[PDB]
Scaffold this active site. Structure first.
Site, PDB file in Angstrom:
ATOM      1  N   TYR A 185      41.428  32.079  57.696  1.00 44.95           N
ATOM      2  CA  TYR A 185      42.195  33.161  57.718  1.00 44.95           C
ATOM      3  C   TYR A 185      41.755  34.690  58.609  1.00 44.95           C
ATOM      4  O   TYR A 185      40.925  34.865  59.244  1.00 44.95           O
ATOM      5  CB  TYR A 185      41.721  33.950  56.087  1.00 44.95           C
ATOM      6  CG  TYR A 185      40.457  34.064  55.709  1.00 44.95           C
ATOM      7  CD1 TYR A 185      39.207  33.321  55.744  1.00 44.95           C
ATOM      8  CD2 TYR A 185      39.561  35.632  55.603  1.00 44.95           C
ATOM      9  CE1 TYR A 185      37.992  33.339  55.657  1.00 44.95           C
ATOM     10  CE2 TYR A 185      38.602  36.149  55.329  1.00 44.95           C
ATOM     11  CZ  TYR A 185      37.745  35.173  55.482  1.00 44.95           C
ATOM     12  OH  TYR A 185      36.530  35.364  55.341  1.00 44.95           O
ATOM     13  N   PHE A 241      38.378  44.220  57.409  1.00 47.05           N
ATOM     14  CA  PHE A 241      37.193  43.975  56.977  1.00 47.05           C
ATOM     15  C   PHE A 241      36.129  42.944  56.798  1.00 47.05           C
ATOM     16  O   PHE A 241      35.414  42.762  57.275  1.00 47.05           O
ATOM     17  CB  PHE A 241      36.891  44.573  55.310  1.00 47.05           C
ATOM     18  CG  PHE A 241      37.771  42.528  54.055  1.00 47.05           C
ATOM     19  CD1 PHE A 241      39.184  42.908  54.484  1.00 47.05           C
ATOM     20  CD2 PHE A 241      36.841  42.617  53.303  1.00 47.05           C
ATOM     21  CE1 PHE A 241      39.992  42.150  53.082  1.00 47.05           C
ATOM     22  CE2 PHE A 241      37.414  41.515  52.806  1.00 47.05           C
ATOM     23  CZ  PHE A 241      38.467  41.122  53.167  1.00 47.05           C
ATOM     24  N   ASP A 242      37.185  41.690  57.322  1.00 46.37           N
ATOM     25  CA  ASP A 242      36.832  40.533  57.557  1.00 46.37           C
ATOM     26  C   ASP A 242      37.938  40.013  58.445  1.00 46.37           C
ATOM     27  O   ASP A 242      39.468  39.991  58.584  1.00 46.37           O
ATOM     28  CB  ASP A 242      36.676  39.519  56.036  1.00 46.37           C
ATOM     29  CG  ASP A 242      36.071  38.113  56.534  1.00 46.37           C
ATOM     30  OD1 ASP A 242      36.286  37.369  57.465  1.00 46.37           O
ATOM     31  OD2 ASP A 242      35.642  37.831  55.285  1.00 46.37           O
ATOM     32  N   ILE A 268      37.572  32.958  45.836  1.00 44.02           N
ATOM     33  CA  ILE A 268      38.156  33.709  44.866  1.00 44.02           C
ATOM     34  C   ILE A 268      39.382  33.839  43.609  1.00 44.02           C
ATOM     35  O   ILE A 268      40.385  32.959  44.108  1.00 44.02           O
ATOM     36  CB  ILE A 268      38.467  35.999  44.963  1.00 44.02           C
ATOM     37  CG1 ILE A 268      39.173  36.381  46.737  1.00 44.02           C
ATOM     38  CG2 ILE A 268      37.429  36.273  45.682  1.00 44.02           C
ATOM     39  CD1 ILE A 268      38.775  37.539  46.837  1.00 44.02           C
ATOM     40  N   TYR A 318      38.071  41.533  42.789  1.00 42.80           N
ATOM     41  CA  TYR A 318      36.531  42.980  42.088  1.00 42.80           C
ATOM     42  C   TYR A 318      37.267  43.718  41.993  1.00 42.80           C
ATOM     43  O   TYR A 318      37.554  44.882  42.232  1.00 42.80           O
ATOM     44  CB  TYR A 318      36.356  43.264  44.254  1.00 42.80           C
ATOM     45  CG  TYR A 318      36.138  41.843  45.237  1.00 42.80           C
ATOM     46  CD1 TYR A 318      34.994  41.045  44.441  1.00 42.80           C
ATOM     47  CD2 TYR A 318      37.052  41.469  46.256  1.00 42.80           C
ATOM     48  CE1 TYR A 318      34.705  39.580  45.082  1.00 42.80           C
ATOM     49  CE2 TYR A 318      36.320  40.503  46.852  1.00 42.80           C
ATOM     50  CZ  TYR A 318      34.803  40.003  46.386  1.00 42.80           C
ATOM     51  OH  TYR A 318      34.559  38.300  47.217  1.00 42.80           O
ATOM     52  N   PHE A 352      45.545  39.366  52.784  1.00 41.66           N
ATOM     53  CA  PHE A 352      45.075  38.274  53.901  1.00 41.66           C
ATOM     54  C   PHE A 352      45.956  37.991  54.249  1.00 41.66           C
ATOM     55  O   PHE A 352      47.127  37.620  54.192  1.00 41.66           O
ATOM     56  CB  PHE A 352      44.394  37.086  52.996  1.00 41.66           C
ATOM     57  CG  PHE A 352      42.827  37.387  51.745  1.00 41.66           C
ATOM     58  CD1 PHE A 352      41.941  38.240  53.009  1.00 41.66           C
ATOM     59  CD2 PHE A 352      42.421  38.035  51.005  1.00 41.66           C
ATOM     60  CE1 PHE A 352      40.691  37.877  52.193  1.00 41.66           C
ATOM     61  CE2 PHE A 352      41.685  38.846  50.224  1.00 41.66           C
ATOM     62  CZ  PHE A 352      40.492  38.498  50.873  1.00 41.66           C
TER      63      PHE A 352
END
Lengths: 97, 194, 755, 107, 377
Positions: D26, D36-37, D56, D82, D99
Site C-alpha cells: 500500500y 503519511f505512509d 484498522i 482514528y 489508501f
C-alpha cells in the site's frame, strides 16, 4: 568454626576460579615495570623540537610537554566551585615526580 | 602547582595529595631559581586565593586521638569472620592518624620554601604586603604544635599505670613523634639566617 | 523547489538548518514513542539517498548524518557502551583454547601480535532489539513507549565502507572543491557513522580486516593506497581518529582478560587434582614422626582462600620457596607470566610492526608539527599514549571488574543483564509518571532471577546499588516537605535496598560507607509507610559487631540533633489534617530513637564505647526528653501515661495517627526507656570490678525513680468477651520496655520480689 | 463507509477469507494530498492476518472486497479509522484517510 | 535598626560603612584616637544617630546636626597628614558616643523562637556595655566600592520617575495644560545607556586568563544589583509603562512632548534586564513565580528583540523554570512563529525546552510533537 572449614577439593570449578584471580594479585602488585619514567620525559618533551621545523622569526613552537602542562593550567583557571576527580591528572602528576 | 592548590579551597581529597607530592620534587635541595619564579607570580597576580587554602587545610589535620585507639584495641580482638577470607582489611590503619603520609609533606613543603636562608619568603610568610588581608602562617603553625603536644602528654597518662608498652602501643606512638620532629625542623628554617 | 538550490539562498537554508536540529532535539535521550512519528515526517528512503549524494550546501544535508544516527541508533549504543567495562566470561569449550596466536612458529611466540579484533570473545552482552514502523496497525490502547525503529543494517554496512573507499582515493587526488565544501565536511560526518556502527560490532571478521587496510602499510599485510594516517588533516577529523583508535585499545584488553580466564581454567583443574593426591599420601595411611601432623595444617584448617595463598606464594615468587609443589606445574607460570610480560610492554632485556609502536610514534608527531587549540582535543590523545605506555596499569585496574561463571546459568544472568540496562537509562531522564511505573516492574523482576542470591560479588562489581541510589536522591531533592512528588516509589525501592544489605557481610560494608550521605536527606520526608530511607540506614548495621565499633560520633551527633527538632515542632503535615498538635510530635520521635537502639548493642548487650558517649551526649540537650517530664513545670511519672489514658478513651479530644493519638504518646515514652535500659553501663562483668561504669549507672538511675516505675506495671485494659479491643489506645503488650528497664538498672535484691 | 474505487483490473475470482495472510504493498495518503505512509519506499511489503484485528477496521473491510492482483483506491471515513485522539505525530485528529492498496499474492 | 550578622552579608553591599570627619580640609588625613567623626551607610545614604528615645536609629541626611551622630573612637574603657595610628584588622578600637558618653554593645534579648529562628541581635548604647566588642576594621576599597554609590544614585533616580509617572495613572489630559510637575527623560536615557555598557559581557578575542578574571568580576556585580532591589524596580517600570498599549498616541495624556520618545524607553529596559540575567544562575531562579508574566506578552509590535532575548537567557541556565510550563505557554510561543514570520531565533528557543544540561524531561517533550508538527503548514 575452624574445623568445618571445608577442604579445597570440594569447590565448584566456577567459584574456584574467581578466588584464584583475586588471590593472584601477588605477581603484578609487587612486580615493577619502571620503564615509563625516564624514557617518558626523554622521548617526549626533550628532543621534541626535531628538524621538522623549517624557519622561525621571534618565538618557538612549544614542545609536546609544554602543551600538556598549560592544559592543566587551562582547566585549573576554569571558573568552577569544586575541582572534579580527573584521574588523568593523577596519572601524569605522579610520573612527573 | 600554586594555581592547582589555590583552586582546591579546603578539601583534603586525593587532589592536593598528588599535587603536593609533585611540588617537593621540583624544589628539593635548595633550588634558588625555582623559588624566585614562584615569588614573582605571587607578587604579580596579587590575589589572595592561596593562603586561605594553606591556613584552612592545616587546621583539618588530625592529631593523636585516644578514643579511636580503644576502638582498635577491641576490634583487633577478633581474628577472622565466620567464613570469609579472614579480616580483609588486616591492618586497617586508617583511624589514629590516617594522614601521616600526607600531613608530613605539607610541612616539608613549607620548610623547603625557606631553604638556603632566603630572606624574602622568610619575610613574606609573616605578612603579605599589598593584597587585601594577611594570614601570618608563622603564628598559624605554632598553634598546631600545641594541640599535638597536648595529645602526646595525654597519651602518657593512659600508660602511666602500666609497666610494659605492648606492640601496638608503640607502632602508633612512633607515628606521632615522627610527625612532631618534622614540624620542629620547619620552625628552625623560619629563623635560620636571622 | 529543489533542495540543491538552497546552497545559494543563505537565509532559507539557515531556517531549515535549525529545523533538523529540533528533530535531533525532539529525539531526547531515548524517546522511542515520538521517535517513530518522525519517520513518517522525514523519511526512510532519502536519508539512505542522501549518503551517495555529492552536491552539498554544507551545514545542510551533511547534518542529516546526525539525524540518521539519532532515530535508528544510540538506543543500544548508549546502553552497550556501559556494557564495555565489565568482562563476565563463562566456562565454554571455545574458551578452553585461547593464547597468543598459537599458529606462530618460533618467532611467532615473541612476535605476530595478531590483528586487533578477529573474533571469539565469549563475553556476555545483551542483543539489540528493533521493530518495524507500521502506522496502519490497530490502536494499541508493553514495551517502553515502543521497542525501537528498524533499518536494513546489511545495506548500511556495505554502503558505508564503499563510500569511505572513495574518500581515501579522492583525498590523495586533491581538488579545489571537495564534497560538502571543505574537506572536513567530506570526512567528519561519514566516519562518525563508521565509529557508531563499530561499537555494536555489526562488522565481522572480514569487514574489520578492510577498515584496517585504510592504514595498510603498517597494520595490514599480515601474510598507491596511502593510509589515513599519512596526510595533513584539519583539527576536527583528528579528534574523530582518536575516537576510532580508542575502540581498538580495549579490544586488546578484552582479549587480554580472556587469555587469563583460559589459564584460570586448566591450571586450577590440575591444582585441585594434584592436591587430592597430596591428601592420600599424608592421609590415614600416614606414617610417623608426630610433628609432621603439625606441618600439615593448611590441608584441613584455614579457610579455602587462605590455602590458595600458601600454595600460590612460592609459584611466582623468587628464590626462597616454602611448602612447595612438584617442580612440573611450577614451570608454565614461569613461561605464562614470562609470556604475559612480553606481550604488553616489557622489553625483557623503522617499521613499527606493532600497534604499541604505531600509536606512540604517531601522537608525538602531531604535537611536534602543530600547536593544538580546542582543549577538548588535547585531552583525547594524551589519554591514549598513557595507556600504551602503562600496560599493566590498565590491566591491574581491570581485574576487579572481571568474573567467571558456569553454564546452565548464563540464560538466567542474560535476563538480569538486559533488565538492569533500563535502570541505567532511567537516571539520565527526568522522573516521569510513565517512567516511574517502568522501574517498579523492573526492580520487581530483578528480585526473582535466581542469580541475585548466589553471586553477590557480581552485584558489587556491576554496582547497581550505586546507580539506584541516585534515583532516590533526585525525586526526594526538594526545598521542604511540600516537595514529596512521586511517592510510592521510594517505598517500592527502599525495600529492595534492605534485603540487599542482608545477604553478606561485605554487602553490609559496601553500602555502610554512605551512612553520612544517607542521613543527610532522610529526616525530612516523614509520614508514609512501608519503608523510608531511615529504615535502610538502621539496617546498615544490625549484627556486624565490628561496624558498630567503626562509627564516627558525628553520625550519632547529627541524628540526635534531628531528635531535638521533634521535641519542639508541631508536625505541620500532621496538623494539615486539622489536628491539635499541642507541643510536639511523638510520631517522628519514635522513628529516630528506633535507629539508636541498633547502635548501642549488636549481639546480646555489648559494645559500650558508643553507648557511653550516647548518654553523655543526650543529657547535654535536655529538650530531647518529652516535656511531660524532665522539665521545670512538672513530671507526672505515673500521671503522664495516666493523662494519655484519659485521652485514650476520649475520641473528641484526639484528632476528631491513623488510629489515635494516645497510642503514639505511649509508644514514645515506652521506647525511650527501652533505649535507656539497654544503654545501661554493662553486665556485672565490668560493674563488679571497675569504677568507671558505676558513674553511668548512677546517672541513669537518678532519672527514673523506682517508686513510680514499679507501679506502672498495672491496669490492663480488658479482654475480649461476649468483642475484642482496638490497637489505637495505650495497650499493655508494649509495657515490657519497663521490665528490662528494671532488670538491668536497679535489679532484684532483698525480698521486694514478693511485692 | 469504505468507498472502494478501482484503479487497475485484477483476477476477480480469488478473494481473502478468514485466518489467511495477505501481502499488500500500500501507500496511504490524506484528503489534502499529503502522504503519511508508503510501503514502497522501504521496499518491504506489508503483510497482515485478516480477522485478528491487526490493521484498522477500514483497512481490512477494504482489503476483503478486492481480488488477487487488483489495485484499488480507498477513502476511509474518520469514524472507522482514528476518530478522536488519532495517532500522535502522523495523522491529525478527525482526518480522512486515503489508501492505494495493491494485493500482490496469496489472496 | 542596627544588627549583627555572620559570614553571609560579609560579601554584600549592606554591611559597607563610610567615615566622614567633621572638618572640611584634611578630611582624608590619618585617623587617630580621640577624634569626632560621623558614620554613613553607603547604599542607604543615611547616617547613624540616637536622637532622644528611639535607639541607635539610622537617621537620614537631614536630621544629623552634629549632635545626634557625634561618634568617636577610644583606646579602651594638625594642618598636615598627621600621625598614623589606627591599623587595619588589629586596632581593636572602641566606639563611644561623644555627647552621651555611652558605650555601644548588643542587647541580645533572645526568646525561644528568636534563638532558633533569626540569628540577629540589636546594638544599643549601654551605659557600661559588654566586654567583647573589640571592633577591628577591614579595608575594601576596590571596583566594588565604586559600584556602591551607583546603587544609591540609580535607586534614587528610578523610584522618583515611577512616583511621578504614577500621579497621572487614570486622568485623561485636559488638552493644553499637560500635568503638574514635569518628568525627566534625558536623564534616564543616558542613565540606562551606561549600565548596559557597564554590564556588557566579556569580549571574544581576549585570552583565557583575562576572560576568566573578568568573568568573576561580572557575576558578582550582577548578584550585587539584586540584593538591593533593582530587579523589582526594573520590573516595576515595565508594569507601569506597559499599561499604555498601541503606540505613543494612547500615551498622549502624559505630555505629548515625551510621546515621540516612547519606543526607545520601552526598549532599553528589556536588554538591561537581559544583562542582569545572562550568565548568572542565582538570579534566574527568581523568575519561576514570574514565568507567567514574561511569557504573557510576546505580541507587542515593539518588543520583538527584547522579549525573545530575555526568554532565551532564562531557559539556558535554570532547569527549574523549565519544569513550570503546563500546556498553554507552549502554544503561545508556537503562535509567535505563526504571527512574526519564519525566525530561527524562536526555533532555537524550542530546542531549549528539550534536554537540559545532561538531564532530559519527557513531560513536555511530546507537546511540541503534537502541536507544532502534525499540521503541515
Amino acid at each position: 568454626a575452624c574445623f568445618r572449614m571445608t577442604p579445597l577439593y570440594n569447590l565448584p570449578t566456577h567459584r574456584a576460579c574467581n578466588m584464584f584471580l583475586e588471590s593472584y594479585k601477588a605477581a603484578w602488585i609487587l612486580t615493577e615495570d619502571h620503564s615509563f619514567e625516564d624514557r617518558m620525559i626523554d622521548d617526549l618533551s626533550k628532543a621534541g623540537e626535531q628538524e621538522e621545523e623549517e624557519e622561525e622569526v621571534e618565538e618557538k613552537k612549544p614542545d609536546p610537554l609544554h602543551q600538556l602542562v598549560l592544559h592543566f593550567s587551562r582547566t585549573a583557571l576554569t571558573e568552577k566551585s569544586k575541582l572534579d576527580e580527573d584521574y588523568l591528572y593523577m596519572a601524569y602528576a605522579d610520573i612527573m615526580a | 602547582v600554586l594555581q592547582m592548590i589555590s583552586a582546591c579551597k579546603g578539601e583534603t581529597g586525593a587532589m592536593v595529595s598528588s599535587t603536593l607530592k609533585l611540588g617537593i620534587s621540583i624544589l628539593n635541595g635548595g633550588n634558588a631559581e625555582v623559588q624566585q619564579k614562584m615569588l614573582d607570580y605571587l607578587k604579580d597576580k596579587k590575589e589572595v586565593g592561596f593562603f586561605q587554602s594553606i591556613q584552612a587545610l592545616m587546621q583539618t589535620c588530625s592529631v593523636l586521638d585516644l578514643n579511636a585507639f580503644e576502638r582498635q584495641n577491641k576490634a583487633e580482638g577478633l581474628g577472622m569472620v565466620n567464613e570469609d577470607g579472614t579480616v580483609i582489611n588486616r591492618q586497617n590503619g586508617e583511624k589514629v592518624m590516617a594522614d601521616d603520609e600526607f600531613t608530613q609533606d605539607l610541612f616539608r613543603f613549607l620548610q623547603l620554601l625557606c631553604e638556603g636562608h632566603n630572606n624574602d619568603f622568610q619575610n613574606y610568610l609573616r605578612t603579605q604586603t599589598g593584597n587585601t588581608t594577611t594570614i601570618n602562617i608563622i603564628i598559624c603553625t605554632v598553634d598546631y604544635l600545641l594541640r599535638l603536644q597536648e595529645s602526646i602528654s595525654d597519651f602518657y597518662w593512659y600508660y602511666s599505670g602500666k609497666d610494659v608498652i605492648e606492640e601496638q602501643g608503640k607502632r602508633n606512638f612512633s607515628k606521632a613523634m615522627s610527625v612532631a620532629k618534622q614540624v620542629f625542623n620547619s620552625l628552625t628554617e623560619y629563623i635560620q639566617g636571622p | 523547489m529543489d533542495i540543491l538550490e538552497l546552497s545559494e539562498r543563505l537565509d532559507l537554508q539557515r531556517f531549515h538548518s535549525h529545523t533538523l536540529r529540533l528533530y535531533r532535539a525532539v529525539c531526547a535521550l531515548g524517546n522511542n514513542r515520538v521517535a517513530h512519528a518522525l519517520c513518517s515526517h522525514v523519511d526512510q528512503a532519502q536519508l539512505l539517498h542522501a549518503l551517495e549524494d555529492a552536491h552539498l550546501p554544507g551545514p545542510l544535508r551533511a547534518g542529516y548524518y546526525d539525524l540518521l544516527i539519532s532515530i535508528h541508533l544510540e538506543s543500544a549504543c548508549r546502553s552497550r557502551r556501559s556494557m564495555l567495562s565489565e568482562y563476565i566470561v563463562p566456562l565454554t569449550p571455545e574458551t578452553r583454547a585461547i593464547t597468543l596466536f598459537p599458529p606462530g612458529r618460533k618467532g611467532g611466540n615473541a612476535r605476530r601480535h595478531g590483528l586487533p579484533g578477529v573474533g571469539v570473545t565469549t563475553s556476555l552482552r545483551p542483543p539489540h532489539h528493533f521493530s518495524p514502523p507500521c502506522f496502519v496497525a490497530a490502536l494499541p490502547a508493553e514495551a517502553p513507549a515502543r521497542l525501537s525503529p528498524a533499518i536494513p543494517l546489511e545495506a548500511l554496512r556495505d554502503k558505508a565502507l564503499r563510500m569511505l573507499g572513495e574518500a581515501v582515493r579522492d583525498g590523495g587526488q586533491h581538488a579545489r572543491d571537495p564534497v560538502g565544501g571543505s574537506v572536513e565536511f567530506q570526512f567528519v560526518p561519514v566516519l562518525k557513522l563508521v565509529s557508531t556502527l563499530l561499537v555494536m560490532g555489526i562488522f565481522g571478521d572480514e569487514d574489520v580486516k578492510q577498515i584496517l587496510k585504510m592504514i595498510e602499510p603498517e597494520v595490514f599485510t599480515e601474510e598507491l593506497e596511502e593510509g589515513l594516517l599519512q596526510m595533513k588533516l584539519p583539527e576536527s577529523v583528528k579528534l574523530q581518529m582518536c575516537n576510532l583508535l580508542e575502540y581498538f585499545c580495549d579490544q586488546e584488553l578484552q582479549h587480554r582478560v580472556e587469555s587469563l580466564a583460559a589459564f584460570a581454567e586448566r591450571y586450577v583443574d590440575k591444582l585441585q587434582a594434584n592436591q587430592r593426591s597430596r591428601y592420600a599420601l599424608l592421609m590415614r595411611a600416614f606414617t610417623m614422626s608426630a610433628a609432621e601432623t603439625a606441618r600439615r595444617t593448611r590441608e584441613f584448617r584455614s579457610p579455602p582462600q587462605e590455602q590458595i595463598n600458601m600454595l600460590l606464594h612460592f609459584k611466582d615468587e623468587a628464590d626462597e620457596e616454602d611448602c612447595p609443589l612438584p617442580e612440573d606445574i611450577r614451570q608454565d607460570l614461569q613461561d605464562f607470566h614470562q609470556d604475559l610480560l612480553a606481550h604488553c610492554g616489557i622489553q625483557l632485556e623503522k617499521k613499527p610492526q606493532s600497534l604499541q609502536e604505531l600509536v606512540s610514534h604517531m601522537v608525538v608527531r602531531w604535537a611536534q608539527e602543530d600547536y593544538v587549540q580546542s582543549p577538548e582535543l588535547v585531552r583525547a590523545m594524551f589519554s591514549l599514549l598513557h595507556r600504551q605506555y602503562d600496560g599493566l596499569g590498565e590491566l591491574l585496574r581491570a581485574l576487579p571488574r572481571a568474573y567467571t561463571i558456569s553454564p546452565s546459568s548464563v540464560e538466567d544472568t542474560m535476563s538480569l543483564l538486559e533488565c538492569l540496562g533500563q535502570i541505567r537509562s532511567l537516571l539520565i531522564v527526568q522522573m516521569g509518571p510513565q517512567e516511574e511505573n517502568l522501574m517498579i516492574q523492573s526492580i520487581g523482576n530483578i528480585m526473582n532471577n535466581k542469580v541475585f542470591y548466589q553471586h553477590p560479588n557480581l552485584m558489587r562489581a556491576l554496582g547497581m546499588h550505586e546507580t539506584v541510589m541516585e534515583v532516590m536522591v533526585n525525586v526526594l531533592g526538594g526545598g521542604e516537605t511540600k516537595e514529596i512528588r512521586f511517592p510510592k516509589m521510594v517505598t517500592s525501592c527502599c525495600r529492595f535496598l534492605c534485603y540487599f544489605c542482608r545477604i553478606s557481610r561485605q554487602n553490609q560494608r559496601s553500602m555502610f560507607d554512605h551512612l553520612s550521605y544517607l542521613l543527610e536527606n532522610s529526616g525530612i520526608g516523614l509520614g508514609m509507610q512501608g519503608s523510608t530511607p531511615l529504615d535502610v540506614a538502621a539496617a546498615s548495621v544490625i549484627d556486624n559487631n565490628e561496624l558498630a565499633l567503626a562509627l564516627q560520633e558525628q553520625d550519632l551527633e547529627k541524628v540526635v540533633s534531628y531528635l531535638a527538632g521533634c521535641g519542639l515542632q508541631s508536625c505541620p503535615m500532621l496538623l494539615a489534617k486539622g489536628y491539635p498538635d499541642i507541643g510536639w510530635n511523638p510520631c517522628g520521635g519514635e522513628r529516630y530513637l528506633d535507629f539508636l537502639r541498633f547502635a548501642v548493642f549488636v549481639n546480646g548487650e555489648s559494645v559500650e564505647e558508643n553507648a557511653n558517649v550516647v548518654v553523655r551526649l543526650l543529657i547535654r540537650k535536655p529538650e530531647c526528653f518529652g516535656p511531660a517530664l524532665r522539665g521545670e513545670g512538672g513530671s507526672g511519672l505515673l500521671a503522664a501515661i495516666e493523662e494519655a489514658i484519659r485521652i485514650s478513651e476520649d475520641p473528641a479530644r484526639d484528632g476528631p495517627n491513623r488510629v489515635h493519638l494516645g497510642h503514639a504518646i505511649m509508644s514514645f515514652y515506652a521506647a525511650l526507656i527501652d533505649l535507656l535500659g539497654r544503654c545501661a553501663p554493662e553486665m556485672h562483668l565490668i560493674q563488679a570490678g571497675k569504677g568507671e561504669a558505676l558513674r553511668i549507672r548512677a546517672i541513669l538511675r537518678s532519672l527514673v525513680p523506682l517508686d513510680d516505675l514499679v507501679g506502672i506495671i498495672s491496669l490492663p485494659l480488658q479482654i475480649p468477651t461476649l468483642q475484642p479491643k482496638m490497637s489505637a489506645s495505650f495497650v499493655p503488650d508494649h509495657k515490657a520496655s519497663m521490665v528490662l528497664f528494671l532488670d538491668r538498672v536497679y535489679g532484684i535484691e532483698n525480698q521486694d520480689f514478693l511485692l | 463507509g469504505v468507498e472502494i474505487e478501482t484503479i487497475s483490473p485484477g483476477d476477480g475470482r480469488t478473494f481473502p477469507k478468514k485466518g489467511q495472510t495477505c501481502v499488500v504493498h500500500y501507500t496511504g495518503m490524506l484528503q489534502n494530498g499529503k502522504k503519511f505512509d508508503s510501503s514502497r519506499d522501504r521496499n518491504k511489503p506489508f503483510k497482515f492476518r485478516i480477522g485478528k484485528q491487526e490493521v484498522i477496521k477500514g483497512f481490512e473491510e477494504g482489503a476483503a472486497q478486492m481480488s488477487l492482483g487488483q489495485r484499488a483506491k480507498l477513502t476511509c471515513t474518520p469514524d472507522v479509522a482514528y476518530g478522536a485522539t488519532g495517532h500522535p505525530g502522523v495523522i491529525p485528529p478527525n482526518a480522512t484517510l486515503i489508501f492505494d492498496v495493491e494485493l500482490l499474492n496469496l489472496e | 535598626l542596627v544588627y549583627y550578622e555572620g559570614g553571609a552579608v560579609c560579601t554584600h553591599a549592606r554591611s559597607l560603612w563610610r567615615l566622614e570627619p567633621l572638618r572640611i580640609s584634611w578630611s582624608g588625613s590619618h585617623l587617630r584616637w580621640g577624634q569626632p567623626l560621623r558614620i554613613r551607610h553607603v547604599t542607604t545614604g543615611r547616617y547613624l544617630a540616637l536622637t532622644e528615645d528611639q535607639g541607635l536609629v539610622v537617621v537620614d541626611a537631614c536630621k544629623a546636626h552634629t549632635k545626634a551622630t557625634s561618634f568617636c573612637f577610644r583606646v579602651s574603657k594638625v594642618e598636615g597628614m598627621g600621625p598614623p595610628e589606627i591599623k587595619y584588622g588589629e586596632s581593636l578600637c572602641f566606639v563611644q558616643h561623644v555627647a552621651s558618653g555611652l558605650w555601644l554593645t548588643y542587647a541580645a534579648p533572645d526568646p525561644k523562637a528568636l534563638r532558633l529562628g533569626v540569628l540577629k541581635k540589636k546594638a544599643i548604647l549601654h551605659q557600661e556595655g559588654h566586654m567583647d566588642d573589640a571592633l577591628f576594621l577591614t579595608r575594601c576599597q576596590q571596583e566594588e566600592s565604586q559600584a556602591a554609590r551607583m546603587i544609591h544614585s540609580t535607586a534614587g533616580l528610578y523610584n522618583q520617575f515611577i512616583k511621578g509617572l504614577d500621579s497621572f495613572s487614570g486622568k485623561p489630559r485636559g488638552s493644553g495644560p499637560p500635568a503638574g510637575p514635569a518628568l525627566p527623560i534625558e536623564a534616564v536615557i543616558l542613565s540606562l545607556q551606561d549600565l548596559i555598557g557597564y554590564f556588557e559581557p566579556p569580549s571574544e578575542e581576549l585570552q583565557h586568563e583575562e576572560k576568566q578574571s573578568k568573568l568573576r568580576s561580572l557575576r558578582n556585580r550582577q548578584s550585587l544589583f539584586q540584593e538591593e532591589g533593582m530587579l523589582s524596580l526594573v520590573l516595576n517600570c515595565i508594569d507601569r509603562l506597559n499599561v499604555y498599549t498601541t503606540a505613543a498616541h494612547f500615551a498622549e495624556y502624559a505630555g505629548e512632548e515625551a510621546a515621540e520618545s516612547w519606543k526607545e524607553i520601552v526598549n532599553l529596559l528589556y536588554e538591561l534586564l537581559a544583562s542582569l540575567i545572562r550568565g548568572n544562575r542565582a538570579n534566574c531562579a527568581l523568575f519561576s513565580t514570574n514565568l507567567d508574566w514574561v511569557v504573557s506578552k510576546l505580541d507587542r509590535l515593539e518588543a520583538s528583540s527584547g522579549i525573545l532575548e530575555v526568554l532565551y537567557c532564562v531557559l539556558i541556565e535554570s532547569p527549574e523554570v523549565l519544569n513550570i510550563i503546563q500546556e498553554n505557554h507552549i502554544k503561545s510561543i508556537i503562535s509567535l512563529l505563526d504571527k512574526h514570520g519564519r525566525n530561527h531565533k524562536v526555533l532555537d528557543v524550542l530546542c531549549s525546552l528539550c534536554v537540559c544540561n545532561g538531564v532530559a524531561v519527557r513531560s513536555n517533550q511530546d507537546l511540541i510533537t503534537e502541536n507544532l508538527l502534525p499540521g503541515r503548514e
